[PDB]
């Protein structure tokens, strides 16, 4: 007994044609709905290739306004038809600012708003800093028809501060659409296990379930210095509130993952365990420094 | 400028609605006897559940926002034109507090105070339920007066009373739940309890109101039945610490004292202990250990 | 072989001499607007307070009564007709009366003749020859951008052009081209003041820092005003110009000729350039609070 | 011709990737400037080595060093004290797990007056600075030296009017920008030098303060994670006056010591008389605290 | 009967072009007020020298001095302490590149309680203040002194009912307005002295608070950028009671020390009984945040 | 040289009989017209004795709706006959609410609209809330055939904010019908009242017209007897606050003053107060307690 919610993580390969990719997302959202899902999660920047392997002027113009975005609009229809909640990842132009953003569509089709990615990565393969202003929404939670949820994006998932921020604001489930794989400058880097552990940690430290949707496939992008290739490693997963993996995909298969949580029992478990009662914000001022002594402006 | 004040003392069942009907009936009698500011005992919506450390009892908490009981006591505050502090178990996202809402005589919600000092030990496992309050000590401006409302265990700390009096409190109020201790029948805290509070009234030159529960309460704890007998002794003390109205340890009681607040403000200003205070010498009060200031 | 892709807009700066008669000056303005349209212009900029002499050399009671309400203004209404006839955008500078307030204002007329709204001059100059603070309330619209048929444009007024804050404010709100109708020249109290190079450099700086084109239209001619302390003369120095998004001057007039300046910009290539250069991606508004002080310490209320 | 006068200097030189050679080169030119009467001497950005930011390399991040007991700073404090000259010292700071592109301001008596950490970090081929440096968290600073109150920022900071205005509002009398800019390895058609000068000249004119920019010269090849990358730094170090006029300029390949004298009392009077600071409208500038023109940053 | 009584004073004198002379003139009149029992003494605006604002001159701007370590404030703090009198000190403030017409409130123990910066800045022939002063950014303020909470604004501020109301709303028990007003050089038919008094008497009566105004006397000739300009300052310094009645007033040509006692507890009590403050309708006053009757300012 | 307007303040004693007073008002409006008035101001609540402080339920039915008001309709006929603007004070019934109001009749007889008294004295001495709800029209200006005018009522008189609000919206002349007097006591507020009003005129640089009744009135009340001697002193002030016409405290008056509205406008603008206002610093005026904004 108690409010139960079924969540789903999707895992698929992308071409660089928007309509192909949106057709793919739709097919899988429906497949998840067919299995009982209430909230379905689509991987980061799914409208195309993960173009950030390059640092190209013409690629910055892939961005589009949040207002009347044709991909958000199309998925609001799906949300409404199906009765599911669908976070929609997109590359946002906002006058001369640009952001890696996500709009949260409620189960009645209502656009509840956006979150703009806060932590922006950088390095060979993942030159995001060239493309995105660091996010200025701050961490947010959204009241949906089924639950209060915290949605952040890809690299944000490495930061315990983001997960905690969402949980302090009542997030009952955390969601992280992701694009991660090999790194083109060094074939010995394999980050998949490290990536999962860090996320399981957030789930267990906040006692909320957590959903992560990652890309698969090889993608080859022309950069300023020639071809660059990433193999994306999937491993989409759902973790429960002690950080146990309840569902996980491999590194190559298209996948639809499903899991049910009793949000009232978990709330009760979260409070009982005591961590939120026991936090010491009085001693946490150092977290507002970068360097361990100087608080930022 | 002549405010009337009341302490109430009553027995609780473990049913929300019965207890609110009982606060409602004792508040109506307070107001009948001329009261302007009626004080209800701590966590009076049910049994004092802090004898147990139970997962399910934490879920007794509710949001401050659109709280069914606060809302009901607002309509009454408003009809009678009396001020009414309302103890409640606050849920605030994942934080939980022992909290009080000050309802002014127009039914207005003037804000909350969150219990700062949290007791612990057999019979009173409050640190299992409550985040130490983060509101700080507060005074509230009501139709009738600036009042200093804190909760139960706070009544042991001279710092809390002094802080409220430094921010203009003309009266101090303390809703309470104290009685026997289940591990040791030899512990009788009633006299000691009254004396520390009489101390706060005398040192600040402010009258003081303490409302405490009566009756026996057996709780099903994680380790079996636990019983506390709440010893009442609800009391209204004057500005020099004198007890001017006192209840017993057993019977239901509606207490009443009138204070001339402008005359008390004159004794206080004229005695002059606020101007004689040496804050330059009180840094040690910001330590716990007598030497290290807390971050 | 095909044209290079994108929205092209042709902008124009006009430069001319005014008498103290409104009908003569509006006639001069129609003649040059039309000559600008003939050479392909889409957006045409008439200099500041063109309806008359730059009367701000004097501080006079009767000159404050030259102001007129924004509603049903005969000059705006006439230029609205012209805008619609030719299909050009025409920002119209005028001295506004608004109950007991007064402002140096500008109404943006779109190419269908629609009055898109006004901007009220925010920064008001002072000193011999330019006693504007005596006439105008500091503007209260704040910095604005206007969606015209051809472009989102930022229009501010004269002295506003010395303030990088204004150009940035418009650029952050999506302005694709900046416009500054101007009245500047010599200074009656000190003939060694020659500000024309200083003036260009500052504005070239806005264009380059925001990676947007910029149009400045300034008056020519000598004008003598009767002041409370005798006649006072300014020689207006022209030098109207149009600068590109690196601040390069693409067209410029001299200090005495009547002129129609013309330049074409590809707003889509410029947008792409402005974004690649990266300054807007790199700005630090978390560090810019001191800009809301006057004295470098105290934030204004 | 009365008033407080100060002589400033822009240096311009080629770097190797050996610290001791570069510091010896800086000393030599600092002393040549002093010989020509300079009071404050500006050395170009990250002069201790090649401009290593063409690459994104794990190992290059470990070039950083603590502000505390930094050997290059300490050596130049000796020189500053010896000749009685103010010397801002650009370096790559390590501060626990944070890293910054920083500058320490040495006063004419040798005293370390503190640091400014670069606020605006560039990115893109040839200039991959965002990979190395936390965006700065000191905020825009002004330093009181023996000769003047000065405002010092760093390189890419020079493209932002906000930084120049912030320093002038706090009483900066002269602006300094140590720089490293040239060609761009992915597009040989980009030639930013005139654009760069124009933007800086605009700051000087809009704040009515002189401005000094010191830029690197020479070709540098870096071994990057994807092969060699070459930039040709274009010098064009200069000194501008308070209306934006260039009073002294270097060309694009010569080593140079540039020198100008400024009367800070006359300039202060001109700045105040022109009126811009009297006429600013901070009540209308709130949009500057956004990125997107609508939403104030947190 | 009983209650806090307070004796206030308006001072009136002519200024020379020597700062120390003028401060000594102030010092001499403050002691004469003190001797007649004054607790709070008001000195006229910009009393350190001639009213220089008839001119719009570059060099006149550099007359400004910082608030910090101001030699006139320091000198007067010693007097306040010596005599136990509160003394507001008008001065021309330099604050980096901003400049204001300001006033420092000195408490009866010599403590500098802070400053208020002139909000409303006048303009026109003879009174070209807008050329010299940024409009004030402190907002209206009230200061707690040993004798009373007082509201001090400056000169032109006194024509604005909004300022007087803002002060009384924040607890001012007495309003103070140091002033420099006389004839106008371009129109000798302008005699604003009756109008000026009426407007202030109106503030007193609307707010049920007493009011003190101190104005300059004497002919001053200033060399302007366009020849000599002369103002004849008209004195008429006065003290008004809480209904606007004038209880003490100086003439238009002589030095004056004016003295009045107010029972602040009786007046407070009279004010709460009248009840205007409880009867205000701020829900209907939004139009006051427009300039034009329609558009709220940002 | 410019638009000239002639304004008049009328002053008379009231009987407690409606037709008598309205016949009196007509007599004096005509007399004003004969001396050239274009805009004529009748004192507050002229249809009868000033009842507002007796707390009598039976005086409540003296209120009448704004719509088809017989006194307003009759004065429209007169306005149109003579070509004069006439603001008409009356006691308005509007449903549950009641207001102290005034309708602005233009020189062609057109009812231009209504203003409702905003500031309503509550507390000791002042029991008006018994009759009037606080006004909800806000401060208004009406464009008449002769001028843009602003009008407010009795107690509004004390509030500089009301005068400023009208001037900011283009009022060129301010009108204040009032009723003020005292007990035959020692308080005589006539000079305080004049000075506050001259203040509004001088601060906004607009002429100001005030009409106040005269005579003694006796009302039988709940406590028992009320007597007031109204003190007249109706006046007309110029845009620098100078009194240009004034009546005494005992006789009927027809005051007349001509103003050149173009010269006054020019003078208002050259003086510069409206150019110099600082609304960015006036937010505190939207509080009651000088700290917290109201809704």
Q: Which of C118, C162, C228, C290 to mutate to test the interface with E (most CBs of E within 10 A)?
A: C228
Q: Yes or no: say if F105 and F76 are a contact pair by the CB < 8 Å rule.
A: yes
Residues of chain C in contact with residue F285, where contact means CB-CB under 8 angstroms, are: none
Q: What is the least distance, in Å, from the CA of C38 to any CA of chain D?
A: 32
- Give residue ranges of A with CB < 8 Å to any B CB: 167-170, 267-272, 274, 276-277, 279, 282-283, 285
Q: How far is CA F100 from the centre of its chain?
A: 11
Q: What is the end-to-end Cα distance of chain B in Å, rounded?
A: 42
- SS3 call for B295: coil
Q: Yes or no: say if C111 and C143 are a contact pair by the CB < 8 Å rule.
A: no
> Which is nearest to E292 in space by CA: B188, C105, B267?
C105
Bridge partner list, C223: C234
Instruction: Please state, as a whole number, how many other Cβ atoms lie within 10 Å of the Cβ of residue B102.
Output: 24
Q: Yes or no: say if E119 and E92 are a contact pair by the CB < 8 Å rule.
A: no
Residues of chain A in contact with residue D297, where contact means CB-CB under 8 angstroms, are: 136
Q: What is the end-to-end Cα distance of chain A in Å, rounded?
A: 48
Read off the tokens for E10: 């308006």
What kind of experiment solved this structure? X-ray
CB-CB: which of E56, E96, E295 is closest to C140? E295
Q: How far is CA A1 from the centre of its chain?
A: 29
- SS3 call for C140: coil
Read off the tokens for D211: 């401005």
Q: Yes or no: say if E249 and E240 are a contact pair by the CB < 8 Å rule.
A: no
Nearest CA in chain E to D165: E97
- CA A248/CA A237 separation, integer angstroms: 4
Burial of C181 by CB count in 10 Å (0-12 exposed, 13-18 middle, 19+ buried)?
Answer: buried
Beta strands per DSSP E along D182-245:
211-214, 217-224, 227-234, 238-240
Nearest CA in chain E to D285: E298
The answer to whether the Cβ–Cβ distance between C172 and A58 falls below 8 Å is no
> Which is nearest to F237 in space by CA: F272, F268, F199, F274?
F199
Strand F173-178 versus strand F181-182 pairing type: unpaired
- SS3 call for D30: helix
Read off the tokens for B251: 């019977």
Show the 3-state SS of C207-271. Answer: HHHHCCCEEEEECEEEEEEEEECEEEEEEEECCCEEECCCCCEEEECCCCCCEEEEEEEEHHHHH
- CA E271/CA D81 separation, integer angstroms: 67
Q: What is the end-to-end Cα distance of chain F in Å, rounded?
A: 46
Residues of chain C in contact with residue D243, where contact means CB-CB under 8 angstroms, are: 195, 197-198, 201
- CA B288/CA A4 separation, integer angstroms: 46
Q: Which of E102, E130, E184 to mutate to test the interface with C (most CBs of C within 10 A)?
A: E130
Q: How many CB pairs under 8 A join A and D?
A: 74
Instruction: Please state, as a whole number, how many other Cβ atoms lie within 10 Å of the Cβ of residue B272.
Output: 10
Q: Yes or no: say if C40 and C65 are a contact pair by the CB < 8 Å rule.
A: no
The answer to whether the Cβ–Cβ distance between B295 and A285 falls below 8 Å is yes
Q: Yes or no: say if D1 and D263 are a contact pair by the CB < 8 Å rule.
A: yes
Length of chain F: 295
> Which is nearest to A92 in space by CA: A171, A144, A153, A166?
A153
Q: How many CB pairs under 8 A join A and B?
A: 35
Contact flag for C and B (3+ C-beta pairs < 8 Å): no
Q: Yes or no: say if C268 and C8 are a contact pair by the CB < 8 Å rule.
A: no
Chains within contact range of chain A (3+ C-beta pairs < 8 Å): B, C, D
Query: Which spans in chain E are helix H?
Result: 19-35, 58-61, 71-83, 161-169, 193-207, 264-274
Q: What is the least distance, in Å, from the CA of A70 to any CA of chain C?
A: 21
> Which is nearest to E101 in space by CA: E85, E113, E88, E84?
E88
Instruction: Please state, as a whole number, how many other Cβ atoms lie within 10 Å of the Cβ of residue B163.
Output: 18
- SS3 call for D281: coil
Q: What is the least distance, in Å, from the CA of A272 to any CA of chain B?
A: 5
- CA C162/CA F263 separation, integer angstroms: 37
Q: What is the least distance, in Å, from the CA of D132 to any CA of chain E?
A: 35
> Which is nearest to C264 in space by CA: C32, C2, C12, C44?
C12
Q: What is the end-to-end Cα distance of chain E in Å, rounded?
A: 49
Strand D87-95 versus strand E87-95 pairing type: unpaired
Nearest CA in chain D to C201: D202
Read off the tokens for D239: 């000194």
Strand F148-151 versus strand F141-143 pairing type: antiparallel
Read off the tokens for D226: 């994807």
Contact flag for E and A (3+ C-beta pairs < 8 Å): no
Residues closing a segment before a gap in chain B (C–N exceeding 2.5 Å)? none
- SS3 call for E2: coil
How much is the CA Rg of chain F, to the nearest whole Å?
18
> Which is nearest to E285 in space by CA: E274, E296, E271?
E296
Q: Yes or no: say if D46 and D22 are a contact pair by the CB < 8 Å rule.
A: no
Nearest CA in chain A to C286: A297
* Kind and range of the H or E run holding F276: helix F273-276
Q: Yes or no: say if C275 and C259 are a contact pair by the CB < 8 Å rule.
A: no
Residue recorded with tokens 């267990």: A204
Q: What angle do CA F198, F200, F204 make, to 5 degrees?
A: 120
| DSSP line for F162-225 | HHHHHHHTT-SEEEEEE--EE-------HHHHHHHHHHHHHHHT--EEEEE-EEEEEE--SSS-
C-alpha to C-alpha distances, F239 to C135, F41, F167, F291, nearest whole angstrom: 21, 18, 12, 33
- CA D41/CA D257 separation, integer angstroms: 9
- SS3 call for E256: strand
Q: Yes or no: say if B102 and B88 are a contact pair by the CB < 8 Å rule.
A: no
Q: Yes or no: say if D16 and D22 are a contact pair by the CB < 8 Å rule.
A: yes
E110 contact partners, CB below 8 Å, separation of at least 6: E77, E78, E80, E81
Q: Yes or no: say if A115 and A102 are a contact pair by the CB < 8 Å rule.
A: yes
In degrees and rounded to multiples of 5, residue A121 shows phi and psi of: -85, 175
* Kind and range of the H or E run holding F25: helix F18-34
Q: What is the least distance, in Å, from the CA of D268 to any CA of chain A?
A: 30
- CA D71/CA E162 separation, integer angstroms: 61
Read off the tokens for D146: 């023996």
Q: What angle do CA E203, E206, E209 make, to 5 degrees?
A: 70
Q: What is the least distance, in Å, from the CA of E92 to any CA of chain D?
A: 14
CB-CB: which of F269, F280, F283 is closest to C64? F269
Q: Which of A277, A286, A293 to mutate to test the interface with B (most CBs of B within 10 A)?
A: A277
C-alpha to C-alpha distances, A281 to A139, A168, A169, A285, A286, nearest whole angstrom: 18, 12, 15, 7, 10
* Kind and range of the H or E run holding C61: helix C61-64
Burial of B85 by CB count in 10 Å (0-12 exposed, 13-18 middle, 19+ buried)?
Answer: buried
Read off the tokens for C194: 């020659």
CB-CB: which of A58, A97, A297 is closest to C286? A297
Read off the tokens for A153: 């994006």
Residues of chain A in contact with residue B55, where contact means CB-CB under 8 angstroms, are: 268-269, 271-272
The answer to whether the Cβ–Cβ distance between C99 and F170 falls below 8 Å is yes
Q: Yes or no: say if F259 and F248 are a contact pair by the CB < 8 Å rule.
A: no
- CA D131/CA D61 separation, integer angstroms: 9
Residue recorded with tokens 């009085």: A282
Q: Yes or no: say if F206 and F164 are a contact pair by the CB < 8 Å rule.
A: no
Q: How many CB pairs under 8 A join A and C?
A: 34
Query: Which spans in chain A are helix H?
Result: 18-34, 57-60, 70-82, 160-168, 192-206, 263-273, 275-278
Q: How far is CA F146 from the centre of its chain?
A: 18
Nearest CA in chain A to D224: A185
CB neighbour burial string for D176-191, b if at least 16 within 10 angstroms, e if fewer: bbbbbbbbbbbeeeee
Strand F39-41 versus strand F64-65 pairing type: unpaired
Read off the tokens for C139: 């503007």
Residue recorded with tokens 């929300």: B16
Q: How far is CA C292 from the centre of its chain?
A: 24
Chains within contact range of chain D (3+ C-beta pairs < 8 Å): A, C, E
Q: Which of F123, F199, F268 to mutate to test the interface with E (most CBs of E within 10 A)?
A: F199
| Data resolution in angstroms | 2.3
- CA D53/CA D179 separation, integer angstroms: 13
Torsion, Cα of C100, C101, C106, C111 (10° steps) = -50
| DSSP line for B15-58 | -HHHHHHHHHHHHHHHHHTT-SEEEPPTTTTS--GGGS--HHHH
DSSP state of D293: S
| DSSP line for D174-191 | EEEEE---B--TT-TT--
Q: Yes or no: say if D47 and D290 are a contact pair by the CB < 8 Å rule.
A: no
* Kind and range of the H or E run holding D23: helix D19-35
Length of chain D: 298
Provide the angle, in degrees to the nearest 10, between the axes of the packed helices B68-80 and B16-32: 20
Length of chain E: 298
Question: With DSSP H G I counted as helix, E B as strand and the rest as coil, what are the percentages for chain D, rounded to 5?
Answer: 30, 30, 40
The answer to whether the Cβ–Cβ distance between D130 and A133 falls below 8 Å is no
Residue recorded with tokens 């409220």: B164
C-alpha to C-alpha distances, E74 to E96, E112, E113, E143, nearest whole angstrom: 20, 9, 13, 19
CB neighbour burial string for D85-104, b if at least 16 within 10 angstroms, e if fewer: bbbbbbbbbbbeebbbbbbb
Q: Which domains does chain F have, with CATH numbers?
A: 1-295 (3.60.110.10)
Residue recorded with tokens 């230029």: C79
Bridge partner list, D92: D101
Query: Which spans in B91-189 are helix H?
Result: 158-166
Q: What angle do CA F252, F253, F259 make, to 5 degrees?
A: 165
- CA B115/CA B155 separation, integer angstroms: 11
How much is the CA Rg of chain D, to the nearest whole Å?
18
Read off the tokens for B101: 């809402």
- Give residue ranges of D with CB < 8 Å to any A CB: 56, 95-98, 123-125, 130-131, 134, 137-139, 185-186, 225-227, 290-295, 297-298
Instruction: Please state, as a whole number, how many other Cβ atoms lie within 10 Å of the Cβ of residue F57.
Output: 8
Residue recorded with tokens 């309400």: C69
Residues of chain C in contact with residue F269, where contact means CB-CB under 8 angstroms, are: 61, 64-65, 100, 102
> Which is nearest to E7 in space by CA: E83, E77, E115?
E83
- CA D57/CA A238 separation, integer angstroms: 34
- CA E236/CA E196 separation, integer angstroms: 10
Strand F208-212 versus strand F173-178 pairing type: parallel
Q: Yes or no: say if C123 and C159 are a contact pair by the CB < 8 Å rule.
A: yes
CB-CB: which of E59, E96, E133 is closest to D171? E96
The answer to whether the Cβ–Cβ distance between C140 and E298 falls below 8 Å is yes
F100 contact partners, CB below 8 Å, separation of at least 6: F44, F45, F52, F89, F91, F92, F116, F117, F128, F131, F132, F135, F153, F154
Q: Yes or no: say if F241 and F198 are a contact pair by the CB < 8 Å rule.
A: yes
Burial of B89 by CB count in 10 Å (0-12 exposed, 13-18 middle, 19+ buried)?
Answer: buried
In degrees and rounded to multiples of 5, residue B203 shows phi and psi of: -70, -30
DSSP state of F154: G
- SS3 call for F264: helix
Beta strands per DSSP E along B184-278:
208-212, 214-221, 224-231, 235-237, 243-246, 253-254, 257-260
Q: Find the farthest-apart pair of alpha carbons in chain D and give their distance in angstroms, rounded.
A: 59
- SS3 call for D236: coil
Residues of chain C in contact with residue E225, where contact means CB-CB under 8 angstroms, are: 128, 189
- CA E240/CA E246 separation, integer angstroms: 4
């Amino acid at each position: 007994k108690g409010r139960k919610v079924v969540v789903s993580a999707l895992q698929f390969a992308c071409t660089d044609d928007v309509s192909t990719n949106v057709t793919t997302a739709e097919r899988l959202v429906r497949a998840a709905h067919k299995q009982g899902a209430n909230i379905v999660l689509i991987q980061e920047l799914f409208e195309g290739y993960y173009f950030c392997q390059a640092q190209r002027e013409d690629f910055i113009q892939r961005a589009k306004p949040y207002k009347d975005h044709p991909t958000i609009m199309r998925l609001q229809k799906l949300a409404k038809e199906l009765g599911v909640v669908i976070p929609v990842s997109f590359f946002e132009e906002a006058n001369n600012a640009h952001y890696n953003s996500i709009a949260i569509i409620d189960a009645d089709g209502t656009d509840l708003g956006i979150y703009r990615k806060s932590h922006i990565p950088d390095g060979p393969g993942y030159e995001e800093k060239f493309y995105f202003n660091p996010g200025d929404t701050g961490f947010k939670v959204f009241q949906t028809k089924y639950a209060k949820i915290g949605v952040a994006i890809s690299w944000d998932q490495w930061f315990p501060e983001a997960a905690r921020a969402m949980a302090l604001q009542g997030a009952e489930i955390l969601f992280y659409p992701t694009a991660i794989g090999s790194e083109p400058h060094d074939q010995s880097i394999d980050s998949r296990d490290h990536w999962k552990r860090v996320m399981q940690g957030h789930a267990g430290a906040n006692l909320v379930p957590l959903v992560a949707s990652n890309r698969i496939g090889n993608e080859i992008i022309e950069t300023e210095h020639g071809k660059s290739e990433i193999k994306f490693y999937g491993n989409s997963f759902i973790a429960g509130p002690t950080g146990e993996i309840v569902s996980i995909a491999d590194d190559k298969e298209e996948a639809v993952l499903i899991a049910e949580f009793n949000l009232d029992k978990i709330k009760s478990m979260r409070h009982c365990w005591g961590v939120f009662r026991d936090r010491r914000p009085d001693l946490y001022k150092v977290l507002l420094t970068l360097d361990g002594k100087n608080p930022v402006l």
